[PDB]
Amino acid sequence: KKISGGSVVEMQGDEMTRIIWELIKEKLIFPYVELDLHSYDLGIENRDATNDQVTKDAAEAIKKHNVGVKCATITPDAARVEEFKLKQMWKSPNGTIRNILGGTVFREAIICKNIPRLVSGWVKPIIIGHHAYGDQYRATDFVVPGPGKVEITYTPSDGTTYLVHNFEEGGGVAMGMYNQDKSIEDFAHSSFQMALSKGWPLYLSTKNTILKKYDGRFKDIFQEIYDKQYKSQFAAAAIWYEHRLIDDMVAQAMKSEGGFIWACKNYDGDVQSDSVAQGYGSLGMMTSVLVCPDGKTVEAEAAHGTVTRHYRMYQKGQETSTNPIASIFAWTRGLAHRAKLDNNKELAFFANALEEVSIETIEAGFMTKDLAACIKGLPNVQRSDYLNTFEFMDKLGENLKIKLAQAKL
Template sequence: MAKTNRITVAAPVVELDGDEMARIVWRAVKETLILPYLDVELEYFDLGIENRDATGDRVTVDAAHAVGRRGAGVKCPTITPDEARVEEFGLKAMYRSPNLTIRGILGGVLFREPVVVPGLPRPVPGWTEPVVIARHACGDRATELRVPGEGTLTLAFTPKDGAEPVELEVYDFPGPGVALATYDLDASVRDFARTAFRYGLERGCPVHLSTKNVSLKKYDGRCKALFQEVYDAEFQADFERAGLVYEHCGADAMAREVFKRPGGFVWACRSHDADVFSGIVAQGFGSPGLMTSVLLTADGRTLLAEAGHGTVTRHYRQYQQGGAAATDPVGSLFAWTRALAHRGALDGTPEVTAFARTLEQTCVETVEGGQMTRDLAQLTGPDRSWLTTEQFLAAVDENLGRKRAASV
């Protein structure tokens, strides 16, 4: 039910719906904590696997362009089908990840950050501040090949300016195997660097870049050099004034070093490293359900927020069998708040941004006060009582109502 005195959101937010349990939780968050408090137009796209199949995945492309046009979007986790999913849903094709399609259109950098709840036990107790993983959204694109048999693999480049072609022998295959060629652009890496440095400045956090430049001297070495170039020319003075630092180290060294620090920094990673390290960070802070995921373009104008977990298939199967929804909705809630805060900043409507920040604070305080869903309750002990998804959202709603009433 809509509350009185709803806050008006000046421009639309693009909503990208998703799959399975995440879709159920998504709707509950929206109906309990977003629409009752905000008068907001949602430009809706259904990225559920059935609709993506019905549209030949055109809906994903249309949704990405809508986010770019509006500047603010919020996305529910979606299925990336494998062979089993193709058979399960009777799909016409094994569609690529919607996130890959969207990132390819929007570009930018993906920031994955945990929600820190004071007092909640975490597997890495020394992490008291967020470890923010910055993933290059467009970097390290690849073309793969299944090598059928004996033969020579070469890598060739033909310049368009008429210069001599370059051809390198990669490997002389004695039999069947596989091959992979990856690529990146200087301009894209520079944007990656600018976005990471700007994010660090805005958050008051140092920035660390990790690469495999020792073994990939040209590929990752170029990334290291471009980051340093951008830092020296555009950000060093601002970082020094703010008392912040930037440094590069090897990926293996950084993976060890991160456990010695309390957090509170941006860790810029090559694309595949970021996928691995963000999973480690999620577990280190307690749960993938506490991870946020924000795609931010280099110019800072366009933001797409998403819960940092998957579609929670196991919970969905239990839900289909009549079980109560007990999935942690914190990640989905924070996806909405991050998108709304950005919408407020774009439109010059601080009341929208303030509402988003208040809702985030209320959510954290609700968990800190002992009201939480099952996966978080298990962090505190095997016998800890827990709330269903709906009960938890109702508790946040009640606490939010009291907070807003007290501020009037």
């Protein structure tokens, strides 16, 4: 009687996001869907026990089945190394998975009509992605004690040098970088595939720098792959591609209506943080998806962390108000991609239905505390203005069952 969903790689997480992960699976997914679920436990304890092998196994699983949904994990530091008595300070799992699959991360904010945004003029979505390290890119730096010269060199592997400074007085710091064309091509392919997947135009952002020969490369690569492999595909989808230099891109974007993909490029180390900033809107309403340049493999993930403070409240038995939208949308976007790969329209209908239910619920006046403060301001919110974690999950469950019952008339 349930829907046959297919094969999905699951990755479990830590702390509060773990609690809510199991809530979602028990209340919103399994009652209506039957899955071929390949579950990997990326909790800090298990990762320590397997010496981080479980992370790699999960990554390869995603490489095999093309669909992965991940719960927020912990990136250990010294403090954590003490808390759990870890063997090593284990690397961030997100970076490992990303390095294995080789895609690009794109982040998005879920829009509700009664939730104010950073710019009031924004109506439509905005989806942002950065070209970060990993790769096939890498870099290095070091300090310089005193007078000397720093020079760069290149030794061809098949049978055969510049200068950056010959300074005299004073010390300093030197740095060198390399960037394969492959990472540029993968970044471009992933961007185009994302814009086609969403049906929005694509803008590429770039700085004006002294590194001219390097600046022109991103240009010519994006533009060429476009002219050769996506011109007509974009024509048929009524979307387009353009380049902007970021100084203009930011201003123009701030007085646009939204509705575009933003591929951000800084001609240096951008790195890829596990989470997005903090002051651009509620983090519970922000998602991320890792898209590979082949357009077939996808990893869905909440764009925030494990919410440690709330977990501390939960351990001591106190009332929490944690926003589950981002994780829910990890599940719904994963399942949606599954449906596209399988041409399973039941699954697609269910996923879009669950997203509609979440947005409708919040817009009807039922929300967690973070959104209530987002409306009024935290020094003005009262208890009657919001619902706790479990209350909100129950509300979502009710409204979902209702919508599905209506659809079956």
